[PDB]
Structures are given as C-alpha cells and as structure tokens.
C-alpha cells in the first residue's frame, strides 16, 4: 500500500539530502523496503521528491 | 572595486592542493589564493596549515570589496576542509552558511585504475 504520491510518508524514509535510508536504520521489512525504494524513485522522476539536496 | 557585503567562499580542497575563491552571489570571482601559491611546494602544500594561510591571503585579496557576510561552499576530500573555514572566520568574516558541494556521480564515468605502489 506504499504509494509514490504519498510524499508525506516518503519523506520519512529519505535523509536530509534526499537519499533513501537503509532498512537497518528504519527497521522495515525487505518487501516494503523494496516497495519504498521503487516509490521513491518514481516520485523522484515526477519531480515530487529531490534527487539530491543540490537539485 | 565596489562594495559587495555578500560573498561566497568556494573552497576546492583537493588531495594535493587547496584553492580558495571568493565570489559574489552570482558567481563572479573577486579574488583567489592557493596553497601552492602561498610559498608551499610538495609535501607542505597538502597540509591544513597551507590551506589556512591560503584562506588568509584570499581574504586579503578581497579587502577592497568590503565583504561582511559570506557563504562557504566546501568541495573535495583533501585536507583544509575545516582549516580554511576557521581561517576565514578568524579573518573577521560572518560565516552565514556552510555547504558541502563535493561532486558525487550516480555511478557515471569509470575512474582510473588502482595504483600498485
């Protein structure tokens, strides 16, 4: 149920520089971590999330 | 030589040298100084002291511009990343922001081969 349009939820799993946080830090399952990575990449494409802190 | 009061300190902290360039907000360079141009060659050039005196001499190359508040953009892994910032703050400068702008390729070009030293 992870949606790339849920930026409020996706921002909890990215650092201050926009990088995805590892599953060891947030303690999320591997399956939902993969879903989160896919959703974050899609949201980066739609310019809803930044690729980096620069641009 | 007019008054800016708003600058950026571009620090290029390479492994072998340290280049400090003070520009305005737009990016036009006003003055610059390096570790190799401050009387350090070879082993002394890649030291935090050389970077410190380079940041001291670069801050003097912009005294005619009257800069009061300036930004810091650090780039590179070499020494003098924090030494230049300290030398800039000690030179009577209000450091407003510090930013790391080291270029990170998202797995782009192929780097050179390992040195078998």
């Amino acid at each position: 149920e992870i949606d790339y349009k849920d930026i409020a939820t996706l921002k909890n799993y990215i650092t201050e520089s926009g990088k995805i946080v590892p599953s060891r830090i947030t303690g999320t399952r591997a399956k939902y971590q993969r879903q989160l990575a896919r959703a974050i990449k899609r949201a980066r494409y739609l310019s809803l999330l930044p690729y980096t802190d620069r641009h | 030589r007019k008054q800016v009061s708003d600058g950026v300190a571009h620090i290029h902290a390479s492994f072998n040298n340290t280049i400090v360039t003070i520009t305005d907000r737009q990016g036009n360079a006003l003055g610059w100084a390096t570790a190799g141009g401050s009387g350090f060659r070879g082993s002394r050039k890649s030291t935090p002291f050389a970077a410190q005196v380079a940041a001291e001499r670069c801050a003097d190359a912009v005294k005619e511009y009257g800069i009061k508040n300036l930004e810091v953009m650090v780039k590179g892994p070499g020494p003098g990343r924090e030494s230049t910032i300290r030398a800039l703050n000690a030179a009577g400068f209000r450091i407003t922001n510090i930013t790391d702008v080291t270029p990170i390729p998202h797995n782009g070009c192929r780097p050179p081969k390992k040195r078998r030293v």
């Binding site: 650092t15 201050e16 520089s17 802190d53 | 650090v74 590179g76 892994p77 924090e82 910032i85 300290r86 703050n89 450091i95 407003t96 922001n97 510090i98 930013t99 790391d100 080291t102 990170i104 390729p105 192929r110 780097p111 050179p112 081969k113 390992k114 040195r115």
Partner: protein
C-alpha cells in the same frame, strides 16, 4: 550537508555541526571510494569479507 548558521550560535559549534553532518552523510568516504576503479570481483570479495568479519 547544508548548514545554516542559526542566530545566537558561535562559529565553532556551527563548524562542528557541519562536520558531524558531512560525516553522517558519508561524502568523504564515498569520494575516497570512487577515486580508483575497483573490479567487480574485488568489490564482491571485499563485501563478502566485511560481512564475514561482521560476525562476532
């Protein structure tokens, strides 16, 4: 690793915060990792050795 020196903070604490942020971002480790080419077999062997020594 953007650090905005907020009001009522000295320069030294801002510099130490900048260093802490740049080390938690891992930019120096990455730029030291990317300066020479590491063969796929070399990086696989290194990852395997690190995963093995992470057992104590």
């Amino acid at each position: 690793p953007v650090i905005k020196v907020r009001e009522n903070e000295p320069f030294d604490v801002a510099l130490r915060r900048f260093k802490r942020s740049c080390e938690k971002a891992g930019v120096l480790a990455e730029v030291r990792r990317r300066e020479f080419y590491e063969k796929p077999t070399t990086e696989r062997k290194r990852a395997k050795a690190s995963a093995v020594k992470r057992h104590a």
